[PDB]
């Protein structure tokens, strides 16, 4: 089972950054798995964007970037999408989608990750 991301990276600022993360081998409708989008520009630290659970509705973000980012999730294509409107130059980064265990309800999970994709905004 591997998590494949997609999305080309070369764009213009104040525009439509869109990233897709999808699963191969299993499904996104498995219960109790923390989904996370976490970015990192090279030279700078690990920056947290988004995190939710697999089996509810209430979704969470970082408040310092919240007007720029939004997340989405659907199982008809098993897509896990990040949307950025009004991108600055401070989002040229590699990006990671992550499936983490919740540890009170799941001793038997596999802490899956994406490989990270590089988006460069001039």
């Amino acid at each position: 089972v591997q998590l494949v991301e997609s999305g080309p990276g070369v764009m213009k600022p104040s525009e439509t950054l869109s990233l897709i993360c999808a699963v191969s081998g299993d499904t996104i409708s498995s219960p109790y798995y923390f989904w996370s989008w976490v970015r990192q520009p090279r030279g700078k630290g690990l920056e947290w964007i988004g995190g939710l659970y697999s089996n509810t509705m209430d979704v969470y973000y970082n408040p310092s970037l919240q007007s720029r980012v939004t997340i989405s999730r659907d199982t008809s294509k098993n897509h896990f999408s990040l949307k950025v409107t009004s991108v600055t130059d401070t989002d040229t980064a590699v990006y990671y989608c992550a499936r983490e265990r919740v540890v009170a309800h799941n001793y038997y999970g596999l802490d899956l990750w994406g490989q990270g994709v590089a988006v460069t905004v001039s």
């Binding site: 630290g45 690990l46 969470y60």
Partner: peptide, 18 residues
């Protein structure tokens, strides 16, 4: 390499410095 401690006390999650 890099290492990071990350909290999960309240939302949002925040990593370490680096």
């Amino acid at each position: 390499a890099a290492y990071y401690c990350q909290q999960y006390e309240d939302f949002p999650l925040t990593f370490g410095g680096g």
